[PDB]
DNA sequence: ATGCTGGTTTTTTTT
DNA sequence: TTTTTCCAGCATC
């Protein structure tokens, strides 16, 4: 239920969001937004970003060939235990590997068997992807030639690649939305590592092949012109039909089901225990 | 001209329009148009009354800068704008220390040692921190010339507390906002608390406690010494003036850096 | 439909 | 000669 705004002023109007363009004033209820995508020629006010962050909404600045910038709130969860579970899973090598296995395995339509050697799955994924690219290139009619990322080549982005990248930007925005709205951290990456938003990519990879590739190929099969926008429409139709944002939330919760384990008391750490917070102690 | 702390510089902008102007930041306010060099800019702090442009965030994202939507004087923290170039080595170090009981205990003892010499105990140190808080309370109750510390508040009822209690709580909120700002501006997590574990802002409280006894308590007691009308606002004003007179953000960032050094 | 004014409705060694 | 000069709700009739 995300919303894309370009060439408009976004401010807080009447306790909600107001987008001022040449058409006048459009008011949008912030209840179901998830992501507010700001295209080029857009200015937003401190109050609008404050309200969106407070309502557990993320702001994603997408561009005309640029980087990715995400505005991050504080989440809908009051004091997330989910984050403590994420940190414990990330910090323990065995649980870490288990989460990595989970993330790789969830990308296959037909579920896999239990006996399946590690680092083989990480290679099996690769053929799926490649065969999905080939499947939709044969289906639509658009030649593939591979993705624009490789080594030793700065081959120009063909339209399908550009559609892939735009839809990827939007999918990453939604991934960030669900991650920070459920109280997780984008920085605790399991497959992607080193960046404060790695987990976003970890989550988005689970739905790239299911939603992005068909939308991009179907958009380039008809257009080859103005894809960056029509891919957004096709991806919107595919996300609000499969109820992705809810599915993502479900996967984010169920993803950590292995190890162990109001709203203003507090706490106090002890060795494998905790004392009550907010009390005087000494003599 | 913009002040740096250790490495990159930072900027607080309020009551202005932020645009990109000539490969840099352009600030349109009542004073006109001001140029800020984006080259090596860690955090750009947006106060209320600032609206930004798609081009400005594009330029900031390309240069690896983060934006922090904060309240007036950074007493409140509202939102973080980050890009994909932001490194998470400090965050990984904090998490690794937090998840291992030995390193966890070591960092907790660091945090305790920063508020005082030392002693040698396990669960009495909590009582010693208690006694420190209480006798500092008593000191500033005497010097201010007022009632006692007490600290009797009800979360459900704001006005069901002492005037000094309300001032104390307001100042605590201000310190928590500034702590949250400095914590996430250096790339750490507010939820990875070593003391106060269990809250998503535990580390914020951990950091704010390091400066409560030096900034919050005297400000609250002296504000109640001024009057008992609008204490909540006066204490915040006096704390703002005392934070800008003591460069508390730089000290906070420096201590946060040294907190995970050599562990 | 026009001045104004405050920058957000707080608390985590309280019980 | 190629825009940006604080934003938004409160109080008043």
Swiss-Prot record, chain B:
Keyword Nuclease: yes
Cofactors that this protein relies on: Mg(2+); Mn(2+)
SS bond list: none
Keywords for the protein's UniProt record, in alphabetical order: Antiviral defense, DNA-binding, Endonuclease, Hydrolase, Magnesium, Manganese, Metal-binding, Nuclease, Plasmid
Enzyme class: hydrolase
Top-level taxon: Bacteria
BP terms from Gene Ontology: defense response to virus; maintenance of CRISPR repeat elements
Keyword Metal-binding listed: yes
Residues at which Mn(2+) binds: 129, 196, 209
A single MF term (Gene Ontology): DNA binding
Enzyme Commission code(s) on record: 3.1.-.-
Role played: CRISPR (clustered regularly interspaced short palindromic repeat), is an adaptive immune system that provides protection against mobile genetic elements (viruses, transposable elements and conjugative plasmids). CRISPR clusters contain spacers, sequences complementary to antecedent mobile elements, and target invading nucleic acids. CRISPR clusters are transcribed and processed into CRISPR RNA (crRNA). Acts as a dsDNA endonuclease. Involved in the integration of spacer DNA into the CRISPR cassette.
Subunit comment: Homodimer, forms a heterotetramer with a Cas2 homodimer.
Family membership: Belongs to the CRISPR-associated endonuclease Cas1 family.
UniProt name for this protein: CRISPR-associated endonuclease Cas1 2
Native source organism of the sequence: Thermus thermophilus (strain ATCC 27634 / DSM 579 / HB8)
Residue range from the parent sequence: 13 to 279 of 325
């Amino acid at each position: 239920s995300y919303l894309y705004v370009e060439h408009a002023v976004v401010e807080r109007e009447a306790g909600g969001i107001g987008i001022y363009d040449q058409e006048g004033l459009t008011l949008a209820p912030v209840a179901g937004l998830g992501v507010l995508f700001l295209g080029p020629g857009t200015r937003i006010t401190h109050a609008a970003v404050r309200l969106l962050a407070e309502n557990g909404c993320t702001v994603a600045w997408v561009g005309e060939g640029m980087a990715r910038f995400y505005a991050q709130g504080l989440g809908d969860t009051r004091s997330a235990a989910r984050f403590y579970r994420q940190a414990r899973a990330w910090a323990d090598p065995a649980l870490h590997l288990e989460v990595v296995m989970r993330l790789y395995r969830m990308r296959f339509s037909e579920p896999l068997p239990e006996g399946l050697t590690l680092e083989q799955v990480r290679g099996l994924e690769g053929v799926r992807v490649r065969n999905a690219y080939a499947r939709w290139s044969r289906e639509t009619g658009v030649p593939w030639y591979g993705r624009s990322y490789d080594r030793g080549n700065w081959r120009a982005a063909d339209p399908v690649n550009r559609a892939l990248s735009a839809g990827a930007s939007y999918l990453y925005g939604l991934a960030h939305a669900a991650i920070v709205s459920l109280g997780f951290s984008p920085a605790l990456g399991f497959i992607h590592t080193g960046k404060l938003l790695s987990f976003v990519y970890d989550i988005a990879d689970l739905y790239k092949a299911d939603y992005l590739v068909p939308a991009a190929f179907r958009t380039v099969a008809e257009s080859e012109e103005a894809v960056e926008r029509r891919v957004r429409r096709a991806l919107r139709e595919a996300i609000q039909e499969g109820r992705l944002l809810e599915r993502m939330a479900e996967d984010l919760l169920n993803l950590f089901r292995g190890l162990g384990l109001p709203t203003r008391p507090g706490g106090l750490w002890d060795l494998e225990g905790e004392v009550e917070g907010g009390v005087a102690y000494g003599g």
